[PDB]
Every structure is written in structure tokens, then in C-alpha cells.
Design a protein around this ligand. Sequence first.
Ligand SMILES: [Ca+2]
Ligand SMILES: [Ca+2]
Lengths: 485, 485
Amino acid sequence: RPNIILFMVDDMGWQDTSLPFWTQKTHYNEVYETPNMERLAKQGVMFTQAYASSICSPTRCSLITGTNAARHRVTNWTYPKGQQTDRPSDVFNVADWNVNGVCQVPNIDHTFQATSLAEILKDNGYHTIHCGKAHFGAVNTPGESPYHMGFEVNIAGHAGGGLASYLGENNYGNRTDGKPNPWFAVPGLDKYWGTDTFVSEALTLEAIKALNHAKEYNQPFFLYMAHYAIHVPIDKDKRFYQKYIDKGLTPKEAAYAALIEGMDKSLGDLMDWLDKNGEADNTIVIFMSDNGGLSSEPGWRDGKLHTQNSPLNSGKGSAYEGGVREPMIVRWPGVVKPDTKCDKYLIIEDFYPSILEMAQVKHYKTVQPIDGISFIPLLKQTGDPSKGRSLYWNFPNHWGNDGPGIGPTCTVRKGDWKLIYYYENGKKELFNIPQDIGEKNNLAAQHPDIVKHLSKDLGNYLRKVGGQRPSFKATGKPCPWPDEI
Amino acid sequence: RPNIILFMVDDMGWQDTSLPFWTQKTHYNEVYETPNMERLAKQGVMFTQAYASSICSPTRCSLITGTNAARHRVTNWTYPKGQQTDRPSDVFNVADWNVNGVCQVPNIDHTFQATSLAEILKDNGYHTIHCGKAHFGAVNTPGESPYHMGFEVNIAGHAGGGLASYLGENNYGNRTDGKPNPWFAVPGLDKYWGTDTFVSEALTLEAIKALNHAKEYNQPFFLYMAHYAIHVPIDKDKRFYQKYIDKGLTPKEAAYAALIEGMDKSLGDLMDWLDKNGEADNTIVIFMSDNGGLSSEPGWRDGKLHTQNSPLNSGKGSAYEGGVREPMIVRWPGVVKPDTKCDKYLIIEDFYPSILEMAQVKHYKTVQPIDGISFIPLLKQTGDPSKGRSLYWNFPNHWGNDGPGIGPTCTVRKGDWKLIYYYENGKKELFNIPQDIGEKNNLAAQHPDIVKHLSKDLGNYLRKVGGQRPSFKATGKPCPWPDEI
Ligand SMILES: [Ca+2]
Ligand SMILES: [Ca+2]
């Protein structure tokens, strides 16, 4: 039974790497430096059409419970207990969504009760390690604890979905007065306060400590290496920052490239550990990101706004490909043909049944229905779970910044066609993704047959799984479903 | 569904309290001060005939696994991975016992695999908290972790069964200059280092914050408050030490009395926390100790050696009552009638079914058989699990000291009669416990009928549960079972 490592970067877009996931190298592929992603890819398969939701919380709750985001209703980011983080709107009320996230127990207000992926792995004999960003439940809610969620070891994981600082010189946001700590102060790295250890480095050091400890136990391990990295604020990692200045990047872009290269140093350190300790041929490594790169905030990024995941449109918080299409690599020695690419689409809730299959766990009990479809047939080249398959997103919410494809929406992807419905004004956009990867050309008027059919598909699904919608403040009435206009 | 607090003291004797568990007050009762134990007893039931094993490891593993010590084979104290702590003998070899303790996973070298009591509570909706001495698995084996054993919260719990120092001035044993930490350094209390916080105080304050956090979750809790007190070394607690010196006690005994009182202050502090947060009426409090007081060592205790649990014979490590009869109290408002006593005997593995029944876990499955018998019928005066019941101990090991009843033995108690068999020379002792509480009068010669039947009772049970035995170095052959002599 293999060890499993799920290496999850935060807010990393499809092109925030030197490894080309498109059909040619982009301007971004040329300036970033991720040699360890390339090396991992030479040894495995990369998925060029892998999907998440557009925001941390819906993606990570889908990962750990195996439900679609429309069903678990954690559709915008969580932290404050019993409170909606949504930006105000003069037009609509957001859905009455599950602001407190997921947990494994019943009767926790505004949560989705679910059998945790880590719990099933643990109860089947895996040693389970969480390291970095957890972000599964609101603060003072059982899901705030990686331990409650079935992890036996927890490094730095709590309810926070961001981080107050990468810099050890700032204690990662922790106060040494009687000052109250920020929400996103990173716990569990006290050993490193006041030093110049970047938080990404510290997480990898502690992760390697946990991995050496796991080698004392005669059981396989599951490691969730969930970086805070490349979430805002984009602090400068001085280990690589100047090199990108010398390369001619703006300070903003140099800072961002340097978070990327530091993330990739963490992957290499783990890969080197696997090599030095004889675990590499018996260990599955999965690389993933949880939503698109941030392309709506010019105070962090340069370039034309909403183009920082080029050639994809927009980014984090958007229904467009820039916000949902993610870099994904799997290495499974003996099973997965090295140096290959797979173009069949999949979505984050598939990780749940797939990882359990990799762990050799069958007919397990869950309190919630599982919406993920295993993508082992893509890993083994034996089947195509994307054929005839519909993928669903639902964001009856209001995130923080305006832009293309951002706002309260629900999306269905089926075959070549993507339907994006806009709850606020009833607008519909139809894109043929293989022909129009940048979502430049709205085909809705040229194909009302596809629009009607896809709208029914989307509408039936949302209602079937209990998905929610916003309502209009002027009238009190719910926004029509896609198939009601 | 009530909250449950299991308050477990280490190495506390039947008479290490001001609350008299005998039918007459002793001199120890006069000198010690446990006013909060008296308070708890006036509101609950005292068990005047409650048994553990004579050593920390078999007792604690029986509690957590519901298994009699003979079956789980963690029959002497554990810490070093894969090594016997047993004293060397030029007479016998000890059993090939489970030096590595218990865990919940299989294929772990010298462990008893078992479904943990905290896992079943956790999986049935309880918020599970461990605070203090865990001592469930050897260092660098899975059961060293309270988290592995099903606790969602761990304060100071590791593989250590002892502690380097009670003094925050001594960092509870943790080194700061250079990297060599002693086995029993107390983890998880770094913010108390270099203060004058006695460790029992530190444990209480962190338990109180774990309970405040537990108020945030809409689920009942289980707190395993397992003190390191009153284990050696007997450090002086300045809060109480001089008072006992003024009462007239020798320094050794004043330090012991001070350990006893600081334990009792912790009990009071949790009891007041319950009172002040509205939890006292829906919380079960179980007071228990894991074995008899240390009466082997004149460098720690004054008075006639091997009498420090008087009127009981001997103490820790002995199969005599001084090694196994423990102080036990249960408060359960609305169920248990206050200020009462229960004479019926019970044994530590019974805590496992009883706590699950208190938690209304009406159905569950376990990988291991459950030897404990619920004592809820004693709490409610509905029945008598004690009638006809045999109790069993097996110590096929070599503890560090000699003394009365200490050495490789197995024991059966049944009705009024207790039979101790000595592996080293086949000696048998038969005592009428209700007539001879001090075990001063061996009645084997007077009742050969009994000795044989109880011999067969013991032998059958040991073989039935797969218990173990020493072997002789002369012949190489196992020591005779009691019913082969
Ligand atoms: Ca994210
Ligand atoms: Ca003990």
C-alpha cells in the first residue's frame, strides 16, 4: 500500500509555473522557475484541464468531503463564526450558505456534516499528517481542527485561510505583546519566530520532521502538504527576489515569482527526502492548486488587469477558466506512464474517491453522498470519466473585487460547452472551451439549443443536490434558476 | 448526553487522601488534605473496593482498551521502543510481553491492537480531550500519541510515564542549551518554563482553556484529566510544603502531602469551572488512581517501609491490596445518590464499557474482546456485576524493587477469597480480604479445597485469554501455571 502525498498550493494559477500546461510556452512560463514541477512531470502525468472552484473554501471542502460545492454550500471563504464574509451588494442578498464550513459531527449550525477523507484513511491504517493551510471550518467550530478532521499530526493548520505574513521576522503575524493576534497568524512555528525562515521553508522543515517520524511506524502515510504559499500578502522571499529583478520583472511580479520558486523548492525538498529515504517508488505524489491566480487586484500584480493567468480569462473568484483551471501532476511509479499528458477533464471532488482507491479502501461508509468520480481510469489509461460528464459550479455569493466572470454565478461544463449563468441580471454566456480557451467569444446567441439544454442540466442539478441561489433586495424574490428565464 | 471527566491520579494510594475509604479514619486521613475529594464524595458515591493493576502501564492500557492486563500483555511499564524495562534476573526470563504498548493499527511489532475508548466516544460525537500522563505506547510507536488513540486535543501527553521535574523553574525537565532531552521531560507547557508554576497547576490551567474552547462546540466532551502527580521525584510544592512541616511531618512526608493537596486543588478547580459555566448538572466526574502508592523506597517515604498504604499491605508493584486497591469516586447528578458508598468490587478494564454506557453509546464494535464489565448497575443500584465474578491480575515480569507481594505473580480474587501465585518458586498465598485487609494471615493450609479451585480458575483464564508466564533459566522450561503445582 503506497504512501500518498497531496501537495496543494494556494491560489496558484494554470500558468504560475515554468511547466507549460498549454500547447506552447507562455510569457509566464518563460520567467517563472519551477524545476521540481518539471522533474515531477517527467516522472508522471500532467492534467491540462483539471478543475477546482474559484475560491479556497468551496474547493478544499469538496476535497475533504468529496461533495460538489453546490451541495455542501461552503461556497465562499470562511473564518468568522456565524457570519457571512460576502461583500455587500446593493442588488442581491447572498445565499444562506454554510458560513462555518464542514465537520464530522451533527448539529453544528451552518455546517455540512461529512465523513472526512482523512478519517477514512486513518481508520483504514494510514498515518495522517496535515501541514499548512487547513481552512475547513470557521473559528470555534469543530472543523477548525485538522485533528477533528482525522489528521493524527497537525502542523500550522487552523481555521485561517490566509496568513498575516511569510516572514519569520514578523513571527508570521504572531504578537509578542498582549496584543490580540490577527486571524491569520500562523500557529505552530513558534520555534522560527524572529529568525529569517520564510514560512514556506518552515512548513517544509516541519513536514520533513513529520515524515522522518512516520518512518518509525509500520503503516503507510498520507501527507497533506497544503502551502499558504502565494496567497496574499506577497511578501518578498529574499532567497530569490533579486534574481527576478535582475530578470527585468517589476517588484510586484518579482515578489510573486519568488513565492512560486519557494513553493517549488518545497516540492523538491520533499522529493529529495523520498529519494534519500527509499520511499520514492512506493509513494504517490499529487500536485494541485485550489483556485486560479489572483488577477483582480492591481496592488499585487502588474500587467493588464485580469490577464495574469494568460491565455485564460480572469482568475481567482471568477467562473472563467482563469479562476477554476488548475495545474495538476500525479506521479505513481509502476502505474502511471512517466512524461505523459492527459487532457480529459476532472474536478476537485474527484480527489476524494480517487485517493481512497489509491489507498486500497473499498466500500467505505460515509454519512454524505459522494459526488466525486474516481479518475484512476485516466491515471491507468483504461477509461474516460469525462465522457458525457457534466461539471458544476455554484457561487451564490459576493467576493471582494470586480471583474470578468466574477459575481454570483453558476456554471455547467459538458463536453466542449461551458454555460455560465449570472444570477444578478439573468445573463448567459456560452463558450466552446477547446476553440476559445480565453473565453473571448460568447456563442449564446448562435446556439440557443445548447443554451436551453445546458440550463436545464444546471438547474436540475442545483435543485437536486440542494444548491442555493441569491435573492433580490428590491422584491424579496429569489433570483431565477438558469432554466427559469 | 452528559459530559464526562475522568480524573486519574498517578501512583496514588488507597489512603493518600483525607477522605476515609476504610471503615475507620486512619492517621494518613488525619494528616492529608483533600477537601475537594470530600466535597465530590458528599455529592456522589465512593467505591471502597476498586482495583487497578499494580503498575501504570497495565492499568492505563486496560482502561483505554477494555481488556484485562493478562490479555493485552502490556504487563510492566513501557517507554523504550522494542526493549524490556524489566530488572534482570539470574533465576528467570520474563514473558515476551508487549513492551511497545497498545495502538489502534495492526502489524506494530510488540503491541496489542485495540479499538480505543476515545475513538468510540469521538466517533459517536464527543469532543475528546487528553491532559497529562498518557503512557499508552512506547516512544516512536503509534500509541505514543493521544491523537492516534482518538483524542482531538492533547495537552502534555506522550510516551513518558514519569516526569523529570514538577518545577516550571526546571522547565519540567526540558533542556534549552543543546539537544539531549530526558525521556520524561513534559511537553506542551513551554509558556510556563522559567515560572514558578507547579506542573499540576499548569495542567489544570491548560485543561481549563481546553474546556472553555469546548463550550464553543455544540457537542458533549470527554476530558481525560490524567495527572503526573503524585509520581516520583517528590518535588516540593512551596504552596503547601511548609504547612505540613508545621503540622509536624518529616520533610519527605511533607513533600508527599503537598503533592496530594495540589492534585486536590486541581480537582477543585475543575469542579468550580463546572459550577461557574453551568455544566455541573450534566457532567459525570470519575475520580480514580492507577495503582498503589510507592512504598518500596525509603529515600522518598518515611515510616515503616512497605506500610505507606496502611492498613493495606505494601504498595506499588505488589499484588497485595496496597498495590491494587484505588480510591474511586463518581458524581453523576440525578443518577447517583449523593454521599453513598459501594462495597462491590470492580476492576479498571470495567471503566471502558461503563464510560461508553454513560455516553449512551448503545452499540459499538471493537477489534479486541472487551473483558471489562459495566459497573453502571452499581451506580444505579439495579444489579451486581460483582456476584460470582472472578478478578484477575498477571505480572510475569520483574519490577525494579523487592517487597511484600512484589515479583512475578498472577492473582485471582473471587468473593471473599484472593489467591496469589508466585512464579519464582510456586508459593501460593490465600487471604480472606474482608477478614484480613492487611493480608497478614495466609490461609492456604487451612483451605486446600479453595487453593486448588482458585488455582484452576486462574490457570484456565490465563490460558484462555492468551496470558503469559516467565520461564526458568536452569531448565529453560516455562514456570508452572498455578494449576500445575
Ligand atoms: Ca485558494
Ligand atoms: Ca502509576
